[PDB]
């Protein structure tokens, strides 16, 4: 299992120690408060009122937690995943990333605390 | 396992199929959007800007997800619990509840989607 | 044989210890009172006056008891099954489920008590 | 081996001449263009931007190729499966099916061309 923090201001995101292999069932729980710029902060689902101005993940709100598995496209995580299995041909290290527009992470603040484990299967 | 929704306006909470027993390890993942009154909505961590005006759980924000185990006091759940073990002598059915002031649930809106399961132990 | 309860509010239903195998003859008796939202309660046949708005089982009323056998589609149970044999090929654990529209189980209440046994064949 | 077409508007799916037996290793390759309604068409992975509105297979995109083996639950095929073995207790005739919402196949168009063979073991 892996536990760590993902910084909102890190465009590169956080590479975890989890390698997702074919058939793996995983659980993720994410918590905390972060911002893509404003003084206010949002949880791991991000800001439901904010427009998509070129987010790294178009399937989640700005300020949401997302991930990549290997070099996959971004996949929404939000508050977490419950006994979840990845699509065909998706595999590799899990990287966690704050959802913002490339080049604009500099004014971000806060972080999410995240646990990831593999489940019985 | 239990999968369902917890209505923000449900003052009595949602009694699940999970009977928490000593030694049990559980995982909860919660998602979605709800309100204690305003037209805005907040995630399962609730509204971090809101004052505590007599909440059922003083250890979580207004609008957060909390729980009771049997007749325990309220325990914060927020976005979820990752392979969590209860305090000594805590046991019984898990009831999920939206965190608001008793007598004020009637104007609430929305719900959280929640999964709970028992983990290997 | 198996005896237990299934909650109206549980989208995941109740996984029983009964494994239905090809050729098996089974009997189920279900009883009790539950609701898909209204203050009134209905028995295991559900509410014959209610429209189907996207139920997990289109072959039974909203509020009815249904089941899956392994990864099958939903199968109506209602008040029960008398010395019943499945449609060809179906096999695996019996999961009992309350018939409602996915995502709308939040306002459900009550439960059904259910007995299942294998018969001679 | 088997080669044939799967029509997007065929809700029942195409039953192939392949009987999957315990221990079998199979390869599937699928190609072509189909739609679940729009004038555009998508390949066998379907439309990655489309919401799941009650698909017969929740583990693939709308417009993806999926299959059943015997009476199994749906299994994603997408572009194909390379030297693949089925889950425990899955066996029987392979039926190929376009992934759409039940009752909504009538406005579908196009087809996938599919090859299936058994591999050495
Ligand atoms: C429309 N709009 C943008 C914004 O803050 C910026 O959001 C972009 C991403 O959409 C980026 O993260 C920038 O670094 C942010 O400054 C807003 C704040 C308040 C209201 C409307 C906003
Ligand atoms: C201070 N304040 C309260 C409120 O809405 C009420 O919140 C209480 C709980 O604190 C209760 O749920 C009531 O039902 C709500 O009406 C506010 C809304 C906007 C700004 C300040 C508020
Ligand atoms: C039309 N209609 C629906 C309803 O209750 C809702 O029913 C759906 C399922 O169809 C779902 O369970 C909801 O959670 C229920 O609130 C009604 C009640 C009274 C009259 C008409 C209704
Ligand atoms: C949201 N949405 C649906 C759609 O076409 C329908 O898709 C459903 C399946 O989700 C079904 O196959 C229907 O027969 C289709 O008409 C859309 C087309 C364009 C944009 C958004 C759509
Ligand atoms: Ca920013
Ligand atoms: Ca309120
Ligand atoms: Ca309901
Ligand atoms: Ca269609």
Curated annotation (Swiss-Prot), chains A, B, C, D:
Gene Ontology CC: cell surface; cytoplasm; periplasmic space
Keywords, sorted A to Z: Cytoplasm, Lectin, Periplasm
One of the protein's GO biological processes: heterophilic cell-cell adhesion via plasma membrane cell adhesion molecules
Keyword hit for Cytoplasm: yes
Domain of life according to the entry: Bacteria
Location, primary (coarse class): cytoplasm
Protein name: PA-I galactophilic lectin
Organism: Pseudomonas aeruginosa (strain ATCC 15692 / DSM 22644 / CIP 104116 / JCM 14847 / LMG 12228 / 1C / PRS 101 / PAO1)
Encoding gene, per UniProt annotation: lecA
């Amino acid at each position: 299992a892996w536990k760590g923090e993902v910084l909102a201001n890190n465009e590169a995101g956080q590479v975890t120690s989890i390698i997702y292999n074919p058939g793996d069932v995983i659980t993720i729980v994410a918590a905390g408060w972060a911002s893509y710029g404003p003084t206010q902060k949002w949880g791991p689902q991000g800001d439901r009122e904010h427009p998509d101005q070129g987010l790294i993940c178009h399937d989640a709100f700005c300020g949401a937690l997302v991930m990549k598995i290997g070099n996959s496209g971004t996949i929404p995580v939000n508050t977490g995943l419950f006994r979840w299995v990845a699509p065909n041909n998706v595999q590799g290290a899990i990287t966690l990333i704050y959802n913002d527009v490339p080049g604009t992470y500099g004014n971000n603040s806060g972080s999410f605390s995240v646990n990831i484990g593999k489940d019985q299967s």
